[PDB]
Amino acid sequence: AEVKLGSDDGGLVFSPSSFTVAAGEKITFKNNAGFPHNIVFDEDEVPAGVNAEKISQPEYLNGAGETYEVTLTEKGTYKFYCEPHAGAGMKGEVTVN
Ligand SMILES: [Cu+2]
């Protein structure tokens, strides 16, 4: 699954926003336009076993085209989002199976 941070004409959103995946798939985030972006996991809706400090990204990023990877493996749901662009409504969610 590939996600693009930022719209293709003027909009800050996680595109796609929410989507399910198989417990063994790779999730690569990609900067499409609107950097710098940020990704963190709310330790309030994350399973009580998958630490959110390892899948989060406390390190901002301002590289055009830069990308990151994440591979969850616990059938459930994880809520992530952007702290800087949280004023617009930039959020993220993944339902693993
Ligand atoms: Cu952002």
Swiss-Prot record:
Cofactor section: Cu(2+)
Swiss-Prot/TrEMBL keywords: Chloroplast, Copper, Electron transport, Membrane, Metal-binding, Plastid, Thylakoid, Transport
Main subcellular localisation: plastid
Subcellular location: Plastid, Chloroplast thylakoid membrane
Binding sites annotated in the UniProt record for Cu cation: H37, C82, H85, M90
InterPro entries in UniProt: BlueCu_1, BlueCu_1_BS, Copper_blue_Plastocyanin, Cupredoxin, Plastocyanin
Gene Ontology annotations for the cellular component aspect, listed alphabetically: chloroplast thylakoid lumen; chloroplast thylakoid membrane
Highest taxon above the source species: Eukaryota
Example of a GO MF term: electron transporter, transferring electrons from cytochrome b6/f complex of photosystem II activity
One Pfam family this sequence matches: Copper-bind
Plastocyanin-like domain segment(s): 1-97
Membrane topology qualifier: Peripheral membrane protein
Family (UniProt): Belongs to the plastocyanin family.
PANTHER family: PLASTOCYANIN MAJOR ISOFORM, CHLOROPLASTIC-RELATED (PTHR34192:SF10)
UniProt miscellaneous comment: The sequence shown is that of plastocyanin A. There is only 1 difference between the sequence of parsley plastocyanins A and B.
Stated role: Participates in electron transfer between P700 and the cytochrome b6-f complex in photosystem I.
Protein name: Plastocyanin A/B
Organism: Petroselinum crispum
